Amino acid sequence: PHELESQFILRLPPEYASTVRRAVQSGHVNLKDRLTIELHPDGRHGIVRVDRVPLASKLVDLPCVMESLKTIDKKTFYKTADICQMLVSTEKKFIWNHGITLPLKNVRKRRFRKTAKDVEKEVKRLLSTDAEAVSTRWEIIAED
Amino acid sequence: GFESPRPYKLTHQVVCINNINFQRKSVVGFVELTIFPTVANLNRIKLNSKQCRIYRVRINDLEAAFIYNDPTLEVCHSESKQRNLNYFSNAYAAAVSAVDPDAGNGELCIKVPSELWKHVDELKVLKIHINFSLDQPKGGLHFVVPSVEGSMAERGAHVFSCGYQNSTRFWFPCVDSYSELCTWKLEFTVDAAMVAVSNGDLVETVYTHDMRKKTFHYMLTIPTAASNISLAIGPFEILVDPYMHEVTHFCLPQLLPLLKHTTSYLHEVFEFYEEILTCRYPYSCFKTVFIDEAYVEVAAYASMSIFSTNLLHSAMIIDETPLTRRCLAQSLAQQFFGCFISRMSWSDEWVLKGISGYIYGLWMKKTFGVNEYRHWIKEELDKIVAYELKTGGVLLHPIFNPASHLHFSIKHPHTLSWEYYSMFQCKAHLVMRLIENRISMEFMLQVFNKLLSLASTASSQKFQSHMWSQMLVSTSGFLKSISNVSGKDIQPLIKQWVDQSGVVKFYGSFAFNRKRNVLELEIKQDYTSPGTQKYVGPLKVTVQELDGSFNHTLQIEENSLKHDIPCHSKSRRNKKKKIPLMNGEEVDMDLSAMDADSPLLWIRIDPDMSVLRKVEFEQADFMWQYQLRYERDVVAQQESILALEKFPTPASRLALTDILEQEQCFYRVRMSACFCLAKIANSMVSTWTGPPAMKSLFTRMFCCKSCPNIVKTNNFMSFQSYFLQKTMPVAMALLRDVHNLCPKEVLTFILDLIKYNDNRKNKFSDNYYRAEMIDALANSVTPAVSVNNEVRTLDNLNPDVRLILEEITRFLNMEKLLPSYRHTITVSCLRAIRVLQKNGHVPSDPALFKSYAEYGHFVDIRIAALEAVVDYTKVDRSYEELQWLLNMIQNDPVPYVRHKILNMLTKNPPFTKNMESPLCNEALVDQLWKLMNSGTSHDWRLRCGAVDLYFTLFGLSRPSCLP
Amino acid sequence: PWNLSNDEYYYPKIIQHSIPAVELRQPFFPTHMGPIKLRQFHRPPLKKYSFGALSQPGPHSVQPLLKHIKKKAKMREQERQASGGGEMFFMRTPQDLTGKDGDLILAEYSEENGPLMMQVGMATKIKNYYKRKPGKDPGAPDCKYGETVYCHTSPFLGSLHPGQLLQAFENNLFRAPIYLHKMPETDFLIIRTRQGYYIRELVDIFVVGQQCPLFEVPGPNSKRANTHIRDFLQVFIYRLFWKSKDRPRRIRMEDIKKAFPSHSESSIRKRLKLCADFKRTGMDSNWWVLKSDFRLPTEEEIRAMVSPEQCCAYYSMIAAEQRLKDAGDDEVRTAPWNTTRAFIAAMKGKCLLEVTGVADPTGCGEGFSYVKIPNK
């Protein structure tokens, strides 16, 4: 079978980003030894090791949706993957408010329309507790 | 991948021609080939040669021994008593396959000398120098030598290479296949007052030491086949094209102004074919030669085209400008895709013929409009469905018999019937239009550009065919290039319309369900006829309802019969609103004839002609009248005209009369509505109210306002009312009264059209309009009432026919003093005299037509007179006229006339196989078997015509009228 | 001697997806999306592998892929020059749609949830609309990507200024103005697969403005919606019959029940009723064999049954159904069936749109709102 590839964006500190960029544009396999990525079983924490120097990482959710688009002639572009996550290196904490481009900053707060009436999972847990019970008493309340 | 059937590879060929003697009809020359053996122990080398006397052959300047035998000279033995045609077709196919260069074979077998075997085993070059002589050629080179005295340039004598497909073996020894590409060096030593035109570019022209002859040196660095090499030697008037400067036009002497006017359009054809494809013209020059007594009307070779002079017209000649224009266009299309990109086998010929015909149709679309394109595509499709339902079917891309339903073998081009060859090219370009329908036109032009670009990168290498075979296209390579550019493969469409050899027949009938508001179509196929096949794909249908025009796709599987499609509202009959059409416009329709319960105005099954089909739809007559009036498609207007002949109601007369009065209708629809109105008027006699049909309309459109019976003086500058004016009396003469005689109101009208004709004021000639007037006079002739077989003399002539006979006598005699453009009035008057002889008016005597069928007349007069003699010998069962025609087939100077006599005697045969006739001797069977076997051995087109004539007369089995 | 075809009275006046996309292959076009997969629509989380090299916990080296990129580009140029040098079609396999080769750009979206969005494997074009200056103009400012077209009539809602070039994504789904920005100096692109991590740099990232929809998203329980569900199930059933190796082609029902688990089995048996029959006993037992009189449709007929853009419109409808369902009339107006109907009706000139409203995907004055207002 075929499994859709999973692309994400890696953001590094600027000096380490310059060393990683120089090693990528060089093209040797020396970069392979220099750059490693260890993702912790939390799922939202990691180490990126640049030149064997550990950096602390967080996998965050991006507010917009990006899409990688490949081309052969630079006139027709084929969508290859959807990017929604970034492993910035240096829950509410795992949500990034800004977008990658310069015009998109504070997009989640300002350029996103918010419509409102985790919570569903809590309601399911409450229903399960009511089922495991015997007698349930309920009242919409006031200030108390 | 191309692997040669020959064990050698030919690199270069020198063709030198000396001593072209026009009095003795003789050429001398040599040929030097440069072959590289690909297999060791080559021993014999097999080349192609017909009619050339081979003097000596030297291989690497060592004397070699050759043996010549041609099995196609006498196909079957003289002392075999077989007389069936299947025996001759198998023997003729085996004989042509025994000289085939597409196998390893050939007619001249040269033995390599012994001392060169150590030169041939380790594969090194061999230079074969044959020198030959054509003593008096019966094929290949045609010598047109007129019998005026003077020098050969002063009398207008010329030579040209004639023939079709691989017929270059007829004038020099070669490897006469389309797959043996080599570079060429061509020298011709001609008279000093003559010019030698050939393929390549002329590098120099040196004089001889007496300065009485000069040698033309041509060089061809683009590797072409031997079959694309041509020659035209004559006293030609040279004209350089004032727009494109590598294009030279050659004509016969005294025809330079006609050449200037005729070949003035060709730069636009060049610009079109170089902008739809993106390759420039591949050859370094282009040469158009116009000659007399041509083989075909247009032949295309490498960097050269040979047309007949009968295409040359002046500025004041209309009705000939589009025909000559499209002959030039298809010669240029074959320059691109028959001569530069060549054929890999005899299969994959459909690819080249289809690409040539398809890009020529794109040229016709841009030049003459989309409506003329649709009319042309419909007439080609009707042609092929008529031919395939008549006899078997045309099989593009056979696999090697694959087609055993037809009396010849399709393994070689020189065994095909000529009608099969014509329908082959026709079906190839329609199947290419179908491939454009599946894979869009820009991807199609990208396919063609990819083929041309591979060929032009191949054309500049020097490697001897390591890369020169990229100039040869195949079917698998064409389908692979299509799959490369588009990502879709067309293998179901290729499997249905190429590999399978049949057309489909659709019988449709509808019923409108008022309750559920649906349209229940009923489409059934006739798949048990001999020419037909079963269609299982999708099918487009276009329904015009009151809310507009809607397209539906139907899936027509084998077990399918009823297709329920949904219908829209009828709220444009509640309010008067305009009904929107197939295009963006909308019109006011008179909805009084429509049914109250159904919204649908007309239905068209397969409107875009996306299959090779024949549709028989059963609409109601008001739906055919609405489709004739308000449709924006010319093929639907034509099919509604064709279907209105079965409904002679006065609403259909009003529909056709409104079509005839309507400018901004396509003119070829109105020209059909004339004949449809004539047929309808003949069918509703004893109901017709006023004057005869189209007469008041003719006086309203083309006559004076103050004088109704005097026609206006001729001004032919509109070109659509000219065609309608010259076609309306021809249809008006088919009117008949209750007594089955043409009325004296229409005959008098035609005679007044003839008398009051004044052409001193238009800038165009009158020959076609006057010729159509003679055709209208010939249409009015009804059969005479002979009593007791009374001899037809001058006193007991019809009082109607005496006026007609006086007019055609005046016209023919005035043509003898002031001739027309191509003796169009001679052809029309000979045709009218044959019409008067076919009825009992003029005595049935063929001596006039036998005097017009002599050699010195123009070729149109000759074929009209020979058509009259063929019709006479069919009706009068004349033995001596049939022997006259068969003798004229055997020894006539013009081979086109011989082919045309065999063609006309096949179309209008003197007897068929079912008839008992007095002309069914063993003598006639022996004459026609001798004409198939020997006698026609020099043309490859007379032999297939003789096979067609023997099939038409005696059938596929043993001639019955025999011991 | 001339035209003579009255053409002005009879006739008065493109996107090629990959072969995995036009064949609706199931990684790229899913048959069924659950609720947690509809909430993560076009935002796929980083899944943990169970088997593979990355499934073992620990540090993992990323691998540079610049010999791979230039080797694949040189190989594709050899393929193109061997095929005559014209433009070629390359995306014929799923392995052509990897990010490991070709010139990648990124495309960011301004709206959170657009009305239409491309699936993986689908193609789009970049058109540079350039309105010339009044009278003399130098020529379109040249751009690295896309082809230039001179637009007198603005494609979008506004009109172009004289001398203004605007790039745009153009496909069958939408048309949207894009704006080229340079990438940040810190961000790279990591393509992870089961075997390892791979790194590219990016240099070009477009910002995609508010989409102008060209395809109408159907509503829930619509006739077009149920027709697409039935046709998608039929196409999947035909492609399972084509994949069957048995000489009487035969499939199993619980393959279809694994693909479409929300479907009642009456609907699946309705699709299998014509074109198949159930064998209970003997050979082929508990299989749905193909009927012997039934001609299985060819590949182009199956492609003509369902289009990929219809699948994208259906996915937009069911994702918006989930978001509305989770959030308990203003929100209903912002549903893509309403907004796509409003915009396409405004483009025919049926009605007008209030450009300031609540369907505004920004939530501020920027951006349009596609909800119908009467033209009176």
Curated annotation (Swiss-Prot), chain A:
UniProt modified residues of type Phosphoserine: S128
Location relative to the cell: Nucleus
Tissue: Ubiquitous.
UniProt PTM comment: Phosphorylated by CIITA. Ubiquitinated by TRIM26; leading to proteasomal degradation.
Functional description taken from the UniProt entry: The TFIID basal transcription factor complex plays a major role in the initiation of RNA polymerase II (Pol II)-dependent transcription. TFIID recognizes and binds promoters with or without a TATA box via its subunit TBP, a TATA-box-binding protein, and promotes assembly of the pre-initiation complex (PIC). The TFIID complex consists of TBP and TBP-associated factors (TAFs), including TAF1, TAF2, TAF3, TAF4, TAF5, TAF6, TAF7, TAF8, TAF9, TAF10, TAF11, TAF12 and TAF13. TAF7 forms a promoter DNA binding subcomplex of TFIID, together with TAF1 and TAF2.
Known partners and oligomeric status: Component of the TFIID basal transcription factor complex, composed of TATA-box-binding protein TBP, and a number of TBP-associated factors (TAFs), including TAF1, TAF2, TAF3, TAF4, TAF5, TAF6, TAF7, TAF8, TAF9, TAF10, TAF11, TAF12 and TAF13. Part of a TFIID-containing RNA polymerase II pre-initiation complex that is composed of TBP and at least GTF2A1, GTF2A2, GTF2E1, GTF2E2, GTF2F1, GTF2H2, GTF2H3, GTF2H4, GTF2H5, GTF2B, TCEA1, ERCC2, ERCC3, TAF1, TAF2, TAF3, TAF4, TAF5, TAF6, TAF7, TAF8, TAF9, TAF10, TAF11, TAF12 and TAF13. Interacts with TAF1; the interaction is direct.
Other comment: Overexpression of TAF7 in HeLa cells inhibits cyclin D1 and cyclin A gene transcription and causes the cells to accumulate in early S phase. In contrast, depletion of TAF7 from TFIID complexes by siRNAs increases histone H3 acetylation at both cyclin promoters and stimulates cyclins CCND1 and CCNA gene transcription.
Family: Belongs to the TAF7 family.
Protein name: Transcription initiation factor TFIID subunit 7
Organism, as annotated: Homo sapiens (Human)
Name of the gene encoding the protein in the UniProt record: TAF7
UniProtKB/Swiss-Prot annotation, chain B:
Localisation per UniProt entry: Nucleus
One record GO biological process: G2/M transition of mitotic cell cycle
One example GO MF annotation: chromatin binding
GO cellular component, one term: transcription factor TFIID complex
Tissue and organ expression note: Expressed in all tissues tested.
Keywords linked to the UniProt accession: Disease variant, Intellectual disability, Nucleus, Phosphoprotein, Transcription, Transcription regulation
Broad class of the protein's primary localization: nucleus
Biological role: The TFIID basal transcription factor complex plays a major role in the initiation of RNA polymerase II (Pol II)-dependent transcription. TFIID recognizes and binds promoters with or without a TATA box via its subunit TBP, a TATA-box-binding protein, and promotes assembly of the pre-initiation complex (PIC). The TFIID complex consists of TBP and TBP-associated factors (TAFs), including TAF1, TAF2, TAF3, TAF4, TAF5, TAF6, TAF7, TAF8, TAF9, TAF10, TAF11, TAF12 and TAF13. TAF2 forms a promoter DNA binding subcomplex of TFIID, together with TAF7 and TAF1.
Family stated for the protein in its record: Belongs to the TAF2 family.
Assembly description: Component of the TFIID basal transcription factor complex, composed of TATA-box-binding protein TBP, and a number of TBP-associated factors (TAFs), including TAF1, TAF2, TAF3, TAF4, TAF5, TAF6, TAF7, TAF8, TAF9, TAF10, TAF11, TAF12 and TAF13. Interacts with TAF2C1. Component of the TFTC-HAT complex.
Disease named in the record: Neurodevelopmental disorder with feeding difficulties, thin corpus callosum, and foot deformity: An autosomal recessive disorder characterized by impaired intellectual development, microcephaly, delayed psychomotor development, pyramidal signs, thin corpus callosum, and foot deformity.
Other known facts: PubMed:9418870 was unable to show an association between TAF2 and TFIID.
Name of protein: Transcription initiation factor TFIID subunit 2
Gene: TAF2
UniProtKB/Swiss-Prot annotation, chain C:
Subcellular location as annotated: Nucleus
Origin superkingdom: Eukaryota
Mutagenesis or variant effect for E77K: In a metastatic melanoma sample; somatic mutation
Post-translational modification: Phosphorylated by casein kinase II in vitro.
Region (Histone acetyltransferase (HAT)): 1-376
Family from the record: Belongs to the TAF1 family.
Protein's job: The TFIID basal transcription factor complex plays a major role in the initiation of RNA polymerase II (Pol II)-dependent transcription. TFIID recognizes and binds promoters with or without a TATA box via its subunit TBP, a TATA-box-binding protein, and promotes assembly of the pre-initiation complex (PIC). The TFIID complex consists of TBP and TBP-associated factors (TAFs), including TAF1, TAF2, TAF3, TAF4, TAF5, TAF6, TAF7, TAF8, TAF9, TAF10, TAF11, TAF12 and TAF13. TAF1 is the largest component and core scaffold of the TFIID complex, involved in nucleating complex assembly.
Domain comment, as recorded: The Bromo domain mediates interaction with histones that have acetylated lysine residues at specific positions. The second domain also recognizes and binds histones that are butyrylated and crotonylated.
Oligomeric and partner information: Component of the TFIID basal transcription factor complex, composed of TATA-box-binding protein TBP, and a number of TBP-associated factors (TAFs), including TAF1, TAF2, TAF3, TAF4, TAF5, TAF6, TAF7, TAF8, TAF9, TAF10, TAF11, TAF12 and TAF13. Interacts with TAF7; the interaction is direct. TAF1, when part of the TFIID complex, interacts with C-terminus of TP53.
Protein name: Transcription initiation factor TFIID subunit 1
Organism: Homo sapiens
